[PDB]
């Protein structure tokens, strides 16, 4: 995740193993219940797309629900791309590129790119956008049961 230190410096840290452990245990008890959503949010403050994927990867042992979630992510990512069809290059040399849907979902962007977006002034909040897609997904799974 990205944390802000006392000087206002945004600093990246790798995801906590204790965070992953708590997430797996949460899902063991509440996988199909509405509380899985605020617990996901509780455990992902400042999370990068890469963090979010690492979290999903640990609960990968659910198959059908995870397929549903991956479908919702792909849907939302398509939708992002339709609203923001990528240009051939950035506005000028030195500028970050605009994220595509797969950049937000962390499958075609590097952690360095994610950090660059998230620490922009003001933030290009790719972790929060992805979290929204994941939550929409978790919501469908709990509705479905
Ligand atoms: Cl990376
Ligand atoms: Zn452009
Ligand atoms: Zn800018």
- Backbone phi, psi, residue 3, to 5°: -120, 155
Range 100-108 contact pairs with CB under 8 angstroms and sequence separation of 24 or more: 101/76, 101/77, 102/77, 103/49, 104/49, 104/77, 104/80, 104/129, 104/130, 104/133, 105/49, 105/53, 105/73, 105/77, 105/130, 105/133, 106/48, 106/49, 106/50, 106/52, 106/53, 106/130, 107/53
Q: Give me ligand 3 centre to Cα 85, in Å.
A: 18
Resolution in A: 1.5
DSSP state of 62: G
Q: What is the domain-level CATH number for residue 15?
A: 1.10.375.10
Q: Give me ligand 2 centre to Cα 6, in Å.
A: 35
Domain count, the chain: 1
CA pseudo-torsion sign 55, 41, 105, 78: positive
Q: Where in the sequence is the domain holding 106, given as residue range(s)?
A: 1-145
Q: Using what technique was this structure determined? A: X-ray
CB-based contact 101:80 (threshold 8 Å): yes
Length of the chain: 145
Q: Give me ligand 2 centre to Cα 89, in Å.
A: 6
Ligand nearest to the CA of 116: 3
Ligand nearest to the CA of 90: 2
Q: Give me ligand 3 centre to Cα 43, in Å.
A: 28
């Amino acid at each position: 995740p990205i944390v802000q230190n006392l000087q206002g410096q945004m600093v990246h840290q790798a995801i906590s193993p204790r965070t992953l452990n708590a997430w797996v245990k949460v899902v063991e008890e509440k996988a199909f219940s509405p509380e899985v959503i605020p617990m996901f949010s509780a455990l992902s403050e400042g999370a990068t797309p890469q963090d979010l994927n690492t979290m999903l990867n640990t609960v990968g042992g659910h198959q059908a629900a995870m397929q549903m979630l991956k479908e919702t992510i792909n849907e939302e990512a398509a939708e992002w791309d339709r609203l923001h069809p990528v240009h051939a290059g950035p506005i000028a040399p030195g500028q970050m590129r605009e994220p595509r849907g797969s950049d937000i979902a962390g499958t075609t962007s590097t952690l360095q790119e994610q950090i660059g977006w998230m620490t922009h002034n003001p933030p290009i909040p790719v972790g929060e956008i992805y979290k929204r897609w994941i939550i929409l997904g978790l919501n469908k799974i709990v509705r479905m049961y």
